[PDB]
Amino acid sequence: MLPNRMALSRQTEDQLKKLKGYTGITPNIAARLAFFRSVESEFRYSPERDSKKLDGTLVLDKITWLGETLQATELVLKMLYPQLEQKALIKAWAAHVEDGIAALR
Template sequence: MLPNRMNLTRTTEEQLKKLKGYTGITPNVSARIAFFRSIESDFRYQGQEAKLDGSLVLDKYTWLGETSDVTELVLKMYYPELDTKGYQQAWAAHVEDGIAAIRNHRNIANLSNTL
């Protein structure tokens, strides 16, 4: 369903890297947290295509880890009409939405208290 190689927008990627600098959480793990924060907040992808121009192109398993199956099932449940490209766009939109809520935490203790 999701492609084997995925990336995000440059802005989202920079925010993930900035969060890594503050907390030590790698971008792939913080992207997972951001995705599920976005799902919990009832954000819904409206089909607006973003330019996924980030330089951090990782394989699906690195981005999603053990949450791979759950992530794909959630996307399929919310967006049954999308194709592979659409699912990547939806995933990227959710990560972008979710990172906004956690990007400014200055340490891991502060972030964990928020979650």
């Protein structure tokens, strides 16, 4: 399942920062909304072709990232990645946040 703390990639963090400056939305709230936007599009994560590293500056607590959407987020990851282990599941979460935020255009 999901670990106590995680980080996004730098590539993702920077886009969250731009979104922060354009809208009021804080990186954690924005990462939640981007996750939802991504999971309801065609984008799906696959381990055998992931190479991107979570080199992000901010390593927040799971509860801080996900707030009162934790259970809903863990449900979604569970349905879409039934066979991934904790280390892959973080990548999928992060890949989804990257995709969702990228889609802001």
